[PDB]
Amino acid sequence: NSEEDKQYLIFIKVFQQAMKGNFAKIYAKTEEGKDPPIKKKVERLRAELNYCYDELSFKEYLSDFLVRGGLNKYFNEHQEEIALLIKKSPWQEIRIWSLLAIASYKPKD
C-alpha cells in the first residue's frame, strides 16, 4: 500500500545492509585483541551525516557509503525505484530516512 512507502522501507533496508557491509569491513580490518571500533564508527557516521550543505554534499556521501557497503541484495531487487528515489526527493528527507536506518539496523544485530 502506497508504493512510495514501500520504496522508503526498502531504502531503509538498503542502507542497513550497506552499513552491515561496512561493519564487516571494519571488523576485518581490526587485528590483535584491540576492540573493533563500532560505537566510534557509528558516532562518526552520524556526525558526518549531520554535516552536509545541500545536493552534491551528502548525496556524494550517500552514494559513497552505499558503495562501501558492497553487495546489497535489497538494492539488487529494485533498481529503478531506488535510483529514482535517490536522484529525486529533497536531500533532507533522505537524511531523515538514513538516520532512521541508523537506528533501525540494530534489529539485525
Partner 1 sequence: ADNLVKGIHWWSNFWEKLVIEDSKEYLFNQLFSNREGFIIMAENSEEDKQYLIFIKVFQQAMKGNFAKIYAKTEEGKDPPIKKKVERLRAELNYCYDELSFKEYLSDFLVRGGLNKYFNEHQEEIALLIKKSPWQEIRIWSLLAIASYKP
Partner 2 sequence: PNYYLYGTVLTRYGLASLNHDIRRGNKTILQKGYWNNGKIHSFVGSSAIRWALRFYLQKQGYLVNRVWDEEEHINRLTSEDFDPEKFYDDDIFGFALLTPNQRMGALGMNMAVSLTPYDGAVKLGAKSGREKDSTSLHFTEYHATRYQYYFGIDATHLKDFSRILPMIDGIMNLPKVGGSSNIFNYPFCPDSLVFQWTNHFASYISYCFEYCDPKSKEAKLSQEFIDEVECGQIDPSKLWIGGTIVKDLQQLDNFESSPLNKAHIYRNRNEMIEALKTVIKRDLGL
- CA 52, 25, 30 angle in degrees (round to 5)? 110
Answer yes or no whether residue 63 interacts with partner 2 by CB under 8 A: no
Question: What is the closest distance, in whole angstroms, from the C-beta atom of residue 19 to partner 1 in the complex?
Answer: 12
Q: Are 65 and 56 in contact (CB under 8 A)?
A: no
Distance (Å, whole) CA 53 – CA 85: 19
Cell numbers representing residue 11 in the block: 531504502
- 1: Cα separation from own chain's centroid: 24
Cβ nearer to a second copy, comparing 34 with 76: 76
* Contact positions with partner 2 (CB under 8 A) in 68-107: none
Distance (Å, whole) CA 93 – CA 76: 22
Question: What is the closest distance, in whole angstroms, from the C-beta atom of residue 61 to partner 2 in the complex?
Answer: 7
Distance (Å, whole) CA 98 – CA 15: 7
String of contacts with a second copy for each residue 3-42, x by CB under 8 A: --x--xx--x-----x--------------------x--x
Residues that bind a second copy (CB under 8 A): 5, 8-9, 12, 18, 39, 42, 46, 50, 56, 59-60, 63-64, 66-73, 75-77, 79-80, 82-84, 86-88, 90, 92-93, 95-97, 99-100, 102-104, 106-107
